[PDB]
Amino acid sequence: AMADIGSMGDPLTWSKALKKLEKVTVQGSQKLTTGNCNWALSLVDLFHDTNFVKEKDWQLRDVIPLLEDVTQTLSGQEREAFERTWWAISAVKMGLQINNVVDGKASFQLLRAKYE
Questions:
Q1: Domain count for the chain
Q2: What is the residue-wise DSSP string for the chain?
């Protein structure tokens, strides 16, 4: 169909987002772990035979449309576990400094519709 000519990226590299990422509190009452992330990334990077987990950086639009199929496969909390991580990582990655995962489900919605 079309092409978004210039969008040049997202707020910051997965790394940066990572750092700030963990700060954002989490579920029960334990913040997020760097690895917690690489986990949900890998969780998909593998499910779709892709390789972001490998890629130095990457834009969500590239991945956000993949999530759906994953969040849709993992049943147990494993699910919320996953999504909630994203809501965040996506939100977070998208310069949306949040003070918690859940808080930023919004941001997701907007990031999905947009890049989905």
A1: 1
A2: ----------SS-HHHHHHHHHHS--SSS----HHHHHHHHHHHHHHTT--TTTSS---HHHHHHHHHHHHTT--STHHHHHHHHHHHHHHHHTT---SSSSTTHHHHHHHHHHH-
Long-range contacts of 11-16 (CB under 8 A, 24+ apart): 11/93, 11/94, 11/95, 12/93, 12/95, 13/56, 13/57, 14/52, 14/56, 14/57, 14/58, 14/93, 15/57
- Say if residues 98 and 91 touch (Cβ distance below 8 Å): yes
Report the CATH number at residue 4.
1.10.150.90
Technique employed here was: X-ray
Say what the resolution is, in angstroms. 2.8
Which residue range forms the structural domain that includes residue 17?
A: 1-116
Contact (Cβ atoms closer than 8 angstroms) between residue 81 and residue 32: no
Please report, as a single letter, which amino acid is at residue 34.
Answer: T
